[PDB]
């Protein structure tokens, strides 16, 4: 089982839900958390953990890791739990900042129907993922990998692509072990 239902009497549940509603902005009043589930994929967790340690040694930017959101469709949920996030299933809607997996800093964005469309029961899927944003650069329509660092840098590419280099709200990640789905929020409209 890649999904374990979290009980409301736990601190883990209350931290996920508090962080969700804090970033829900104008939607805070219009969205109800139905269910919270822990995502279990030990191989990815362990691989993510190694990636994390190498970025802590290397990166000029702190923090190396952010807790971001990813709204998805109901049929894509078993895929992410079992295999993690896959940039090859770019079907979703668009890839205006590159052909990667899109993460939002605020649940207010991921909770929009175009990202988390409700099923027939009105349940909307929003993954909580630990993402290794690292050193980021500007996203663009052509990107198949992170943006180029350009002159003044030893490395050729950044770790992630962003919507705005000044005040980022969207992060695009282009590596299979760079984002770890830790929870699934099943929410709905009031």
Ligand X SMILES: NC(=O)c1cccc(N)c1
| Least distance (Å) between residue 69 CB and ligand X | 6
Closer residue to ligand X (CB): 71 or 147: 71
Residues in the chain: 190
Of the pair 13, 127, the CB lying nearest ligand X is at: 127
Site string for ligand X, 17-36 (x = CB under 6 A): --------------------
Of the candidate spans 15-23, 50-58, 97-105, 140-148, the one that interacts with ligand X by CB under 6 A turns out to be 97-105
Is 136 a residue that touches ligand X (CB under 6 A)? no
Between 37 and 76, how does the x/- string for binding to ligand X read (CB under 6 A)? --------------------------------xxx-----
DSSP labels for 90-141?
TTSS--TT-SSEEEESSHHHHTSTTTS---TT--EEEEEEEE---SEEE--T
Q: Which is nearer to ligand X, 144 or 153 (CB)?
A: 144
Residue with smaller CB distance to ligand X, 92 or 175: 92
Q: How far is the CB of 109 from ligand X (least distance, A)?
A: 5
Residues near ligand X (CB under 6 A) are 69-71, 102-104, 109-110, 115, 170
């Amino acid at each position: 089982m890649n999904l374990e239902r979290l009980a409301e009497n736990t601190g883990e549940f209350q931290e996920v839900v508090r962080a969700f509603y804090d970033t829900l902005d104008a939607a805070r009043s219009s969205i109800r958390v139905v269910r919270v589930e822990r995502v279990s994929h030990p191989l990815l967790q362990q691989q993510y953990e190694l990636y994390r340690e190498r970025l802590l040694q290397r990166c000029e930017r702190r923090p190396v890791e952010q807790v971001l959101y990813h709204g998805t469709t109901a049929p894509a949920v078993p895929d992410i739990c079992a295999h993690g996030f896959n940039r090859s299933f770019c079907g979703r809607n668009a890839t205006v900042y590159g052909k990667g997996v899109y993460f939002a800093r605020r649940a207010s964005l991921s909770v929009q129907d175009r990202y988390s469309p409700p099923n027939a029961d009105g349940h909307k899927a929003v993954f909580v993922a630990r993402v290794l944003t690292g050193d980021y650069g500007q996203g663009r329509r052509g990107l198949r990998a992170p943006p180029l660092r350009g002159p003044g840098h030893v490395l050729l590419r950044y770790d992630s692509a962003v919507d705005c280099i000044c005040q980022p709200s969207i992060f695009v990640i282009f590596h299979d072990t760079q984002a770890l789905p830790t929870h699934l929020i099943t929410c709905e409209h009031v």
